[PDB]
Design a protein around this ligand. Sequence first.
Ligand SMILES: O=P(O)(O)OC(CO)CO
Ligand SMILES: O=P(O)(O)OC(CO)CO
Lengths: 246, 246
Amino acid sequence: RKYFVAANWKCNGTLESIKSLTNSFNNLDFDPSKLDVVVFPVSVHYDHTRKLLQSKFSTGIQNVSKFGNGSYTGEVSAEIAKDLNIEYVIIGHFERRKYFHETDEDVREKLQASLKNNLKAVVCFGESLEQREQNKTIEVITKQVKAFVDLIDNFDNVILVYEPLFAIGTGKTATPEQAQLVHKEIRKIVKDTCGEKQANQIRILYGGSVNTENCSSLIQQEDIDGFLVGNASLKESFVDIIKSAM
Amino acid sequence: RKYFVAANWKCNGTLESIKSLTNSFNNLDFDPSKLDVVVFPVSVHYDHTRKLLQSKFSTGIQNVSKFGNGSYTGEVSAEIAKDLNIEYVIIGHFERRKYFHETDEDVREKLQASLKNNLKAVVCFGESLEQREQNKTIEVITKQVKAFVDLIDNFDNVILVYEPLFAIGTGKTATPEQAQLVHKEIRKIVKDTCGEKQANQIRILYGGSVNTENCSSLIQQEDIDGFLVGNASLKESFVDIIKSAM
Ligand SMILES: O=P(O)(O)OC(CO)CO
Ligand SMILES: O=P(O)(O)OC(CO)CO
């Protein structure tokens, strides 16, 4: 499996900081045929970032609409995306499930619209702190994954991301072992419902807090194929997180 | 009052159709100091559209976030908008209230974030078909307006838009008279809660279906100061709607 390292800038950035940040990123020398590195800027920053990042870096948007072109003020459709040649899109990030009540149904439809338009998808899912304490982690994960996994046709174009919400912002910590356990169960769910060749091909990223110090012990895990970095991706030291996967 | 004519492209467009459409728009000769004409493209199309449209045309985005910079995947903040020099933003469009459950609280917060960052706002509100039949039109509007009207400081930078939802997609038609009545009640709500100089200064646009044939009889109304055009703005004949307000 080809490692995958994504930078989710979320809602941050100014024309200037981005110029500076990309300038750092460009310096890192790596083979894009051996590693996937994707940068997800704010929609209105897409063109700007794309012109500054060299071809070795892929780019994409943080969200895609579940509807197609039409009367949907404020949305961006997979079609619009395809036309601009955006390559990846993030789907189901917990922040959207939390503040915008995006449901598993939305996730499914968005994924469908994306695949139909030849977009690659970074699909997110994970259990809450409350669900983890109730030992429902696997039950929850299974449900969420089984909500869209059947729509996956090409397992090189859909990247799954496990976002242990429970650890993110609660004073908790997901250890390389804990994550490796779930990453194994997810991969098993794919195997049982899509076949082995597929399960061994699909990539499952860790989406909890990742930084220059813990990235190595994470990428080392068997079923962890890279990550979806958050705040760390806003620093120049992000290049080291990439190096950890070279 | 300086007339206002806005083009809400919603979720439509391709790099090519936009080049063609703007080419048409550019041809129309008008004085921007006498008339406000604003185009709202898809976020990912903003730069492209802005480079093609001549200075006489203002541009803005279809939606703005209620949060500031930070962990809000998929959102665009007023701060980021300001940095890019985006001038206007649409807030509360019924399509967002309908499909994304944006509430009057979201509208207030979004408006606040916008004003704090020196952005001009196009605020939308309107009653449903069901509420109109129950003769609750004035009641509903008053509520929605009284949800943010106090935050208005500079009455040249906030444009109110009445979107008679009822007439949009039900087989109903809002006559120039019907709209003119509501526009009068809205302006009175501003007068009683913000004063006369303000009420007489703020622009109140009509948001129902507008086309080359009914625009004139609408702009003629006393309390109608322009419009927020939808599908008609996707045609080259949109220039005639502009002319109707010159
Ligand atoms: O938790 P942080 O520091 O915001 O960053 C993330 C995710 O959201 C790490 O992959
Ligand atoms: O109803 P249409 O044709 O989509 O256009 C609109 C609004 O949404 C007219 O201002």
